[PDB]
């Protein structure tokens, strides 16, 4: 049977590695923006979608979009807002029903935008990706662990919602560039399992069995995916102390 | 707009689509079916039209696609088959190519919906790589889409069997006037099926068609052998969830490639 | 407005911003024309590697 096999996980891990964003575009291609200017519009960003009420793709698929343009050309200080109010304009179209309005982006930057240096910006950056728009999401891989896991619908629902929440910390970090969506998404899922130390975990599937096995069908060692766990939950507790 | 074409040492096609644009951007239609023909030549699959580029040019936006160019479609090359026809380890190669393509579109959650021997384009080299898809002829038509019902990947396979039968016939399997004529031109071989069988929210209920028995299917493609012939039927089966896969097919130990 | 609605990294020279944008939406677009002998607005064949037909 293909559950055996999952001929479909496997093309998800090739196609994971086109739309991958360089380490060092900081140090090799950004001139005028730092590591410390991502992390502020990523949040503006992250509070945008959460405003908006946005699917939980776009947010983290923005990002992607983000890295990928820093990666191919320098971009001024000034115009960080418009790259990443665009990057939210076309991750929008890709997983929404009915996308963000050009106009209401130009509003969450406090009018510093105007509509038309929107759009013309979209033709840029799709032109730039070369129209590689689908790219892999963490949510993907999400939702193929979560079809493997022999747990209750209910106790799915935490684990997803707590796993997003993960994902959308990991996407305002500069420390997660180099994860590939597969990582990020199943250290999210093993640190949701843990439950965010409210309660000792009650799961049908075990912990160990769970990360050996997210461990061999996205090819690491078991001690790697713990320290990208570790890495998740320090995430949670700088972003709490923001307060 | 207007086809062109190149070559160097290969061929490469054109295709020129203007967009409405204005209102907000590119349309949502437009990103994300280039995005997904986008992400299929990632993986590179030999039996599959190779999209090379893509080019937006801005008011007025037009975004042109490139693609890869073959010359030989199915029908030409049937059409220049040797007098007795091909030979059958040739049909199995192809039928190999075939289910490994539309294979892999399905794995990419993409229906043909439209298969039919000028879509299938072979080199010259013989390598059979499917063309138009994400972007009158009724013969090719599975039961569900010819019903106006619900219909998903599975109507392609049922058009891989009317072209199976076709290159063992070299003339089309059911060739009828309207949707109701080629459901009835359907129903010579797989006789009539039975009641729950039959979905709703149809546009012909099943009383429109006399009571039928299936016929025997080397009938119809005789040249065929015994084992192909189950496989026919698993193609051309009614019911959609009952129809055979793609890898399915390629699984049958007709299609398996001896030595 | 509300609170995600703010200006991050200061003004913005919108005049040199549509100048720089149209630049390079350009740029491509000659790189492109220049890479397929084919210029897209123009939709018509140039000359060089590849010898472009019409069917």
Partial sequence: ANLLNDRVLRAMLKAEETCAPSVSYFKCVQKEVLPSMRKIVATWMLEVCEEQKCEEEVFPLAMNYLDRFLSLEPVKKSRLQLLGATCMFVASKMKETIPLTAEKLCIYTDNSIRPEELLQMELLLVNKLKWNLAAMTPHDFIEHFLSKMPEAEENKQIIRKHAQTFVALCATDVKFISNPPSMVAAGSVVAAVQGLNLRSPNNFLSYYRLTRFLSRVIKCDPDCLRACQEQIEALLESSLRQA | ?259 | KPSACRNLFGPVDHEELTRDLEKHCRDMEEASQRKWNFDFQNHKPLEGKEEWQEV
């Avoid at chain 2, 979905?199 to 009938?219: M, N």
């Fill in chain 2, 1 to 259: 707009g207007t086809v062109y074409k190149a070559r160097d040492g290969h061929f490469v096609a054109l295709k020129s689509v203007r967009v409405p644009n204005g209102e907000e951007g590119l349309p949502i239609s437009t990103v994300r079916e280039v995005a997904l023909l986008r992400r299929l030549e990632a993986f590179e699959h030999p039996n599959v039209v190779r999209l090379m580029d893509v080019c937006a040019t801005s008011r007025e936006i037009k975004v042109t696609l490139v693609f890869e160019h073959v010359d030989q479609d199915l029908r030409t090359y049937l059409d220049k088959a040797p007098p007795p026809g091909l030979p059958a380890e040739t049909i199995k190669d192809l039928m190999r190519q075939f289910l490994r393509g539309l294979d892999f579109l399905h794995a990419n959650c993409i229906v043909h919906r439209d298969l039919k021997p000028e879509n299938i384009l072979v080199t010259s080299g013989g390598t059979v790589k499917l063309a138009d898809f994400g972007l009158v002829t009724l013969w090719y038509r599975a039961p569900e889409v010819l019903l106006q019902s619900t219909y998903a990947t599975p109507v392609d396979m049922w058009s891989v069997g009317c072209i199976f039968a076709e290159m063992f016939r070299r003339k089309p399997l059911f060739c009828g006037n309207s949707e109701a004529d080629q459901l009835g031109k359907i129903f010579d071989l797989i006789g009539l099926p039975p009641e729950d069988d039959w979905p709703r929210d149809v546009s012909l209920p099943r009383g429109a068609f006399p009571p039928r028995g299936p016929r025997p299917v080397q009938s119809v493609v005789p040249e065929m052998e015994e084992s192909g012939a189950q496989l026919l039927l698993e193609m051309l089966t009614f019911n959609p969830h009952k129809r055979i896969s793609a890898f399915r097919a390629l699984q049958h130990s007709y299609l398996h490639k001896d030595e």
